[PDB]
Amino acid sequence: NLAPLPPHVPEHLVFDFDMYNPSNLSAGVQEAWAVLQESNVPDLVWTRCNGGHWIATRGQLIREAYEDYRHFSSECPFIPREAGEAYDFIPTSMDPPEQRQFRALANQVVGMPVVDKLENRIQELACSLIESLRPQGQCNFTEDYAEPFPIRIFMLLAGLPEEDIPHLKYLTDQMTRPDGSMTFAEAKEALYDYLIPIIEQRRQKPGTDAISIVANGQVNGRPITSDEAKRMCGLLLVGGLDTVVNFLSFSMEFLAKSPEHRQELIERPERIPAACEELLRRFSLVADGRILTSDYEFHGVQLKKGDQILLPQMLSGLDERENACPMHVDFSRQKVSHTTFGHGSHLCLGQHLARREIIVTLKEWLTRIPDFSIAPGAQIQHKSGIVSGVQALPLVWDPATTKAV
């Protein structure tokens, strides 16, 4: 389903990429997207899928568009338009300087200090889940660890019931990797039907959880409104539920195939941090974009006010002009260039949480289960969308090679 090419688009800039269903999906998600960086594809292309939009395919362009909020606005950050239109998440749907007050608050809830505080639970939960897995010789990493780990830590943080996971997780999946079962607005509304009664309660009777801190916070000297709180909380949910979850599966899938990488980390633990950056570069997974605020000429292409452009954060680090041998995971790269957690004013506030969770998972898993692989005859499937994922990850191992700690 291709939308008719608008007038201002040179037919030579057409490249019909479906961000919801790239062509080389079988090969892997990052590999499927990276077709945008072949010699045949211009730096800035137009796809007729998902109703027509620009895509910047290079690190240099993505970074620039990101920095440039004057021209490229977050007002409508999602493709398709209706999805970007229906989204009113804060601070994500706002530009500086408005953005800034809301961000400062969100930072209170997720920043460094909170991670430092939660660190012992993070470690506790990872050890406990792993130890629980170990003797079995087999899981579903996606369901058995990558889902529970990051999620139970978020629920804890936000003061929400474990019982709500199944429910929330579905709604969140609908937003980043729309199924067709429900539109974006419906998905947004139901998540919202959820939070509303909750924020009500925490404005009345405050706790120490994130929702309470958000719901009772100050923004530009006055108190945040219920609607504003609803809107920040929405973002927190998706970030909390949907990101690290998918990140871990790509990473683990990689580790399950690369014994030598496992070993390197086992013998030279001082490398964990450096490896974490490299996996963040290679298994980058977020693709969103911006809306043009006017007619503007970018890198020789004429953009019309109201044109949406996808600025795949995933693509910067997979670019050869930024990283030599981009598809190759190398723990000792002198410089790991990426924009995994974004660029410009919208840099991810929850990056600290995310890294802490990755490093723990690697350090702890490898410790107990140093030798593992993918189940013989399992075919791993990735999924594409705003945030990409792994469908299932069946792992197998000999319990006899594990070590209980």
Ligand code: HEM
């Ligand atoms: C490994 C996982 C993660 C990745 C790759 C990721 C990536 C991103 C990206 C690319 C952006 C900017 C989007 C834009 O510019 O449109 C962003 C923003 C955001 N992220 Fe993350 N994120 C992750 C995890 C998290 C977590 C765990 C949280 C906290 C619950 C979170 C909270 C946020 C917030 C609050 C913003 C908005 C910042 C602003 O608008 O000022 N993220 N993230």
Ligand SMILES: c1ccc(-c2cnc[nH]2)cc1
């Ligand atoms: C949709 C909404 C939120 C996000 C996100 C921000 N940080 C992590 N995930 C990604 C897509």
